[PDB]
Structure formats: C-alpha cells, structure tokens
Amino acid sequence: MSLPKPEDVLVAPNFGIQIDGVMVEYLNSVSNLQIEQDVIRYQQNQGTTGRNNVTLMPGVAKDGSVQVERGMSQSSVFTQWINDSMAGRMATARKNATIIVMDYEDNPVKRWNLRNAWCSKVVAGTLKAGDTNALTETITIVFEELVVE
Amino acid sequence: MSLPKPEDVLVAPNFGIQIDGVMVEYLNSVSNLQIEQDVIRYQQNQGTTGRNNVTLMPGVAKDGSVQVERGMSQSSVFTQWINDSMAGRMATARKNATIIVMDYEDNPVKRWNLRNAWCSKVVAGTLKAGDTNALTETITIVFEELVVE
Amino acid sequence: MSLPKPEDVLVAPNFGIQIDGVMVEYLNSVSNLQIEQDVIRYQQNQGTTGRNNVTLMPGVAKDGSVQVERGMSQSSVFTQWINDSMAGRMATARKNATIIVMDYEDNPVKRWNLRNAWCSKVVAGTLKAGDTNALTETITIVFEELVVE
Amino acid sequence: MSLPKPEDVLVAPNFGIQIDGVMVEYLNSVSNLQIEQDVIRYQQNQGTTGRNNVTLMPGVAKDGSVQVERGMSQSSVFTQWINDSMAGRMATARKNATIIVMDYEDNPVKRWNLRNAWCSKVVAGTLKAGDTNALTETITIVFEELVVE
Amino acid sequence: MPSYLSPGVYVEEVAGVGTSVAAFVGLAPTGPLNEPTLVTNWTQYVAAFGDFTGGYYLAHSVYGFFNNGGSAAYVVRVGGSAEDQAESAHPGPAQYLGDSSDRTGFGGLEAIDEISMVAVPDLMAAYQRGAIDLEAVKAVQLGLIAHCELMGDRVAIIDPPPNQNARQIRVWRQETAGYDSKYAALYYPWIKSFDPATGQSRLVPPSGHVAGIWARNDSERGVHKAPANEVVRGAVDLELQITRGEQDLLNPIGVNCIRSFPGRGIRVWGARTLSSDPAWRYLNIRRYFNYLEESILIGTQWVVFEPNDHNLWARIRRNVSAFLVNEWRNGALFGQSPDQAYYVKCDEETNPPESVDLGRVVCEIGIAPVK
C-alpha cells in the first residue's frame, strides 16, 4: 500500500476464534446499520411549508454473518458448537474478522464481534451422483449482537 | 459543448464534502419528486360526467443517495462519520454532487444536498478466496432531506 | 530520415528497463486505443432524421505488450521479476520501447510505459525431441496502464 | 473515361484533410448502409398467405474507415490528432476521399466525410528482428457519422 | 446580390463574442480617454464611467445589455462631464473620425470588428439645450446609417424626435427625414424609467433595453425569429398608448411600436425595417443574413490565394454545404429536403478561365434570394 491508488483485495480473509475454524472458503453479509426516523410537521403559524425532520437518531441494528467452511471433514468443530447451545449452555464467544493486504504481513482492518455471538445453523450442501463440481460445503450461521471496527 | 448535439457524459462525477471522500467509484439513486393527489367528483347538477382533479399539489419527497467508495483502505473516513451519529451527536453536513464536461474545466451542473444529510449505513463486500474480480468495495448510504439543483 | 519518402524498417526494437535483460527478437501488439460511445437523438420537433452523437469522448483503454526473448539460458532475470510479483512485493518498472532505425545512434521514437509495468505471464516453448529446427524461446507478458508517444 | 466499357482501376486513393499528412498506401471498409426492418401481416380476412412488409424504411447506419500510412517516420501528425481527442479538446475534421482515374488531373469521385471525422485508434505493426521484409506501418482508425457520394 | 466573393472585390487589400455585442456613442460622467473604445460588462463599466452623476443617457442605455439579455458592449466616450461644444453636430454623436484618427464617433468604430448594432444615446440629450436643429440631427443619423452601410455587417438604431404625436412622425417619416435603408430601424414611443441616483423618473428613448431584446431573442431561438412579441424588461411605463387606428398608419411606413398590453405588460410589437425595398421589410430576415455571413466568412478564412484550382473549389463547396445543411435539419429553412432548401455553386463558370488574381467566387441561394 505504497500509493493511495490500491484497495484491499480478497487476499486472505481470516478469523480469531477459540473454536478451530482453521480453514475457510468465505465470509459474507457483513454490515453496519444505524436506524433513522422520520417526522413531518406543519410550520410555525405562518405561510411557509412544513418540515421534515430526519436528523432523529434511533439505536443501532444487530445481525448475523454467513460463514462458509470449505466442506465436511472428520473434525466436528462446528457441530459441537451448535450442540452446546442446543443443550442450553450460553456457549457464546468473541470473534475477529481480519482483512489482509497484498503483502500479508500488513493486516490493517479488523472487526470485533461481540462476546455474545453464537451459532444458530448448520446447513449441508446437496449430495447428487456425478455432480463433480459440488463438493459438500457447509454453511454456518452466526448471530452477531454488535460489530465494531 | 460547442453544439446542441452533445450531452453530459460520465466523465468525472465528484463531491464537495468536509469528510475526506477523496476518491470514488460511483453515485446512484438520485431523484426529484413532487407528490400528486387525486380526487373524483360528480358534476354540477346536470347530464355531464364527473371530473378528475389531478392538479392538486402536495409537498416534496425526500430520500437518500447511494455512494460507493472504491474499496477499503487504512483510512477510516466513513467509519468515523457513522460512529459520530451512533454516539448521539447531530453530526450532519452539506454536500455537493458535481457533473463535469468532456473538457473538465467546464462544470455546469451541481446539486445541493441539505445540511442535515447524514450516514445511516456502511456495507462491506463479499470476501471469498479466489474471486479475483471482487475487490472489497464499500457502500455508504446517506440520507438527503432536500435536494436542490 | 535522409529523404522525405522512406518508411522506417525493422532495424531493431530496443528496450530500457531497470532489469538487465540483454537480447530479444520481438515486440508484439502495441497500440493506442481511445474508447468510443454514442447516442441517437431525435430532431428539433421536425420529422427529420435525428443525429448520431458519435463524438462523445470516453477515457482510454489499457492493455499489455508481449515480448519474446531470444531464448532460454541460465539467466534468471524474467523468473525473478515474476517471482516478486507472485510473492506480493510490489516491484513495478518503468519501460521505454525504442524502435532504433538505420543509424543506431539516431533513435527518433521512444514510447513511455508507465512504471506500473508488471510481468504476469511466462510461457515456455514446445520441447520435442528430434524437432531440429527449433530453439526454446521465452515469452514474457507485461501489462501496462499507460503508453505515451 | 475515354470509352464506355472500362472500369476504374487502382490508380490512387487521395485525401483532403485539415491535417498535413502526406503519403498512404490504403483505404479499407468504406460503405453506405441503410437499415432494413420488417413485419409479417395476415391477409384481409381471407385464408391467404399474409404479406411481408419488407420496405419499411429505417435510418442509416454509421461506421468508421481504416487507413494505413506508408510508415513510421519522425512525423507527429497522427499522434497529435489522437492526443487532442484523448485530452477532451474537441477537434474534429472534415474529410474528402478522392478517386482519381488513369488521368491524375481527372478526379470524378469525391466522398464527403462529415466534420465528425474523429481518430480513435492508432496501431503499431510488429517489430521482429531479422524479419527483413517488413517495414513498420501505421494504422489510423477514424470514425464518421455520415458519408455522402 | 451581397458579396458572395470577398471582404473586398477590386483589390485584395486584405493581404468570438457573438451577436450580442453592440456599440454606443455618448458622454460619460467620468470615463477613460475617449478614443480607445472599450468593451465591457456593467460591473466594470460603472467603475470607469460613473454612477449616473453626469446626467447622461449612456448611464441608462447601458443597462440594455445588463438588466436584459447581454454580455458586454463597446463604449465611445466622446468627452466627460463638466465640473460640478460637444452638443454640436460635428463632434461626438457625429462622424468624428479626426482625419483617420479613429476619434470618438462612427469613424472611431471603423477599425473594430464584432459589432452587430450601433446606438447613439446622447444625440438628443442636448436636443433642446444645444439647439440641435432638425438637420443637426438628420445629418448625424445619416452619418450613422452610412457608417453601417459601409461596414456592411451591422445596423443602425435610429431615435425618433423627443416629443410629438403620431401625425408628426408620419410627417418626418414621409416629408422631412425619411432614411429608406436596409441598414436601419426605428421605434416610436418614449419609455418612462427611473434614475436611482436621485429619484423615481426619467424619460429615455426606445433603445437600450429595446436592443437588449435582440440579445435575448437570439439566445431563445435562431436569429430567424423576430422579437415581434417581447417584454421590455426594466420599463416602467410608456408616454402614450398607440391604438389600432394609429397602428394602421404607422406600421405601413416602417415605424415600430411598443405597447402596454392588457394582461401581458410592456412589449415590443412592430418588427419592420426603416426601408422602402420590399425585400428587406422584415427585421429578422435582414438579421438572418448578417448572421450567416459572419459565421461563414470567419470559417472559410484562407489568406493569399495560391493557385486558382478546382481542388480549392471542391474544398469550398463541400464546406459551405456542410454548414448550411444544419439550417435545414434544424427549423431555420423551408423545404422538404436540402435539394430545395439551399443551393451552393463554385466551379469554372463562377471562376472563368481568365483566372485573374482572386477567384474563389461562390454563388449561394438562401430561400428565394440569391447571394
């Protein structure tokens, strides 16, 4: 990043996690939303129009981020995470999504996911004879209460 | 623009802003709307049809314009703008969207966005290994109470 | 040069580079390309054929120039340039394509190749036993943003 | 010209332009093209084959003419024309493509090229050492809205 | 047939801003030296001339190009205000060249190009004070018209006498000072306006803003359209309303009127040339021709003809037609096709074998008339 001209590229997205999500394919659905509000009023006892107040500022939204593990293997890392929550333990954890530069030693952007994050879904891919380009991917859905840069 | 035949081209859209949105990819969802009204009546005690009055003129609509920054970099310009609003300060600002001619010194069209404009969203792109043509774009959503040419 | 009639002939391509390559046979696909755009517009409320705005003026296209080195040798010059690129160590170079004609002292044409000049591909020739007419050539493909006459 | 039977031969292409180019070898792809459109319509409530309206009359197509200059030389004429275009300085030209018969004095055919005449591409030939049959040619590609016989 | 050959025919002695630029002759409160006619905007004009303190008409007619459509205009100063002779028909609003000195006056503008109209706001400024006899006025208006006829590409704005009834203008027009020329036009009623330096009213001639209208008109539509219905922006009122029984007598003799219309405001209505020649009766037609001439003459500007040759004829024919076909494609010309809409000829019959010095003879047809 010697010039203002480059932008971060999909070089090496990776994750800080205590659960061994060691190798991944991709990360998606990541966003930051502040909810707005809208009120319309009539003006102060005179011949002018009403006003629109859109400078009102309600709280911050929460969501979840899709995580795709390349595929099934013999190591049931995500399966146990979901089992602990189904069993009733508040088995949540902090996570860190990292964006990395062309020269990988440079790691400028990180997003902190709240300690209350947890897994609600595990989804299998389709298994069909002869598909060839279908390679048993797994989709993990994690709820993120709060995301901070 | 020596002739009536040319039209403005996508030569150099740029922006007046105190927040350092120095380099951009694009601007979209820009429109000007006056709301209409529709009433139907029966005619004046005679054998003629009713009338439709569509010359009624309610107030002017407000909206937001999508802004796309080429991509993530180490300079967190937009992130802080959204942080200030989430924190509760009415951190709004005036903006100017400029349309430029083939010979760039000629800058004939400008749109003024009200001082109450603010950022409600920051959205990340998808990060997937090997995508290549996916280059970590960021989408910024700004609410514009009033737009004037 | 000595007469008003003569057309330059293939005396020699010659190159400036910060990398010490020594001998080549050729340079292919060098061009200066401006993009065209157009519209059809109806006439001035007269039923006359409209106008074709074919002089709208877009930006300039970018491409790459292919070169062939006389042949494989023990030299590692083209290999290391591509290795820095693949390794993520930005190492672009400034190039100068000079078509020296007749008098090697006289070099009337020199073309600027922006420093972002960057080697992307190295291609080997065919190795066939008994094909006693062939030598092994190397193909180096270099991408560039801007070429100036 | 002297007889009713003879067909014009390739004596010489000749050109009018406001730019002082001097010698060329050829002119390619010159055409006059009207667009066709059609419909199928059923007969006059009689079970007879309908009619093909193939004489509906659309507007006229637009294209460009390619020329080849005898060769590279120290002249900057084609380079500067394209530089004004790329720089955004409208600089179109009026052209006249002339066919001269066995009699160089006799110039029976002259074609108008609307002042739109705008150079879009400049292409270099191949530079290969030892290819002692080749000279370096230049290709100039000029776009035009209208050609009149 | 107006020249279709050259800026000059017998001798080739010869070896932009647009139609909105005009020139005005009169006195300044202060002003620069009077000879170097300058062209500028209100903003700089007032800084050099003065804020109406001299009581001169230029101070007000200048607004014609600033409180109405315009850009810049040329001003000939003549002389300035007395502290705290110029009223003669010889100096100032006169052909006051100075024996090839280009001194203030119609003569001082001979060396200046890019002027479409010339006005003389102070000619009648001293009509009463300077005893400007009728001829003293007539002689100047004749000098102005002659100037315009000689330059060939600009027209004269002629003022009516200061205060008289309809009968009296029918009189000077037909009996004492008719001018009969394709290069001039006159409007009749005087316009009431104010003067902020001291108060609510002053009377001014139907110039200034009246000319501001031409600049406005040319921006709205091609010069072909006449400003036969346009608002005299900046006007307050008129001295007299001229009724239909009077319009019936004045329009046939070339006198243009301005009227207060019941629901439309103060507008220019008449649009005739102060000429006896039927061909040039309409102002917009006379203007269309000056418009085409300025642009075509600048465009095909080659100096010192090399060899009389068909190759030049071909370049010329092609360029003139390319220029004119757009007038046809656009709404300016009449006809179903270029074939009828216009005509260009330049060949050995306009440029015969004698080939003496300048050739370049191009014959052209507009709609009906031929150049």
Numbering used by the authors:
A (entry chain g), B (entry chain h), C (entry chain b), D (entry chain c): 1 to 149
E (entry chain I): 1 to 15, 28 to 96, 232 to 518
Q: What's the publication's text?
A:
In general, CIS are composed of a contractile sheath that surrounds an inner tube loaded with effectors, fitted with a baseplate complex. A conformational change in the baseplate complex triggers the contraction of the outer sheath, which leads to the propulsion of the inner tube into the target. Here we provide evidence that CIS from the model organism Streptomyces coelicolor (CISSc) function intracellularly and belong to a new class of CIS that exist as free-floating fully assembled particles in the cytoplasm and mediate cell death in response to stress conditions. Similar to the recently described sheath structures observed in AlgoCIS15 and tCIS19, the CISSc sheath is composed of a single protein, Cis2.
Different sets of two (IE), three (IEG) and five (IEGVG) amino acid residues were inserted into the N-terminal linker of Cis2 after position G25, resulting in the mutants CIS-N2, CIS-N3 and CIS-N5, respectively. For the CIS-N5 non-contractile mutant, more than 95% of the complexes were seen in the extended conformation. In vitro, the length of the CIS-N5 non-contractile mutant was homogeneous at ~230 nm. Next, we optimized the purification of CIS-N5 particles and performed cryo-EM. Helical reconstruction was used to generate an EM map, which we then used to build de novo the sheath-tube (Cis2-Cis1a) module in the extended conformation at 3.9 Å resolution. Domain 3 of the extended sheath (Cis2) was again too flexible to be resolved. The tube (Cis1a) structure and fold are highly similar to the tube structures already described for other CIS. The comparison of the sheath (domains 1/2) in the extended versus contracted states revealed an increase in diameter and shortening of the length upon contraction, similar to other CIS. The introduction of five extra amino acids in the CIS-N5 mutant induced conformational changes at the Cis2 N terminus, similar to a previous report.
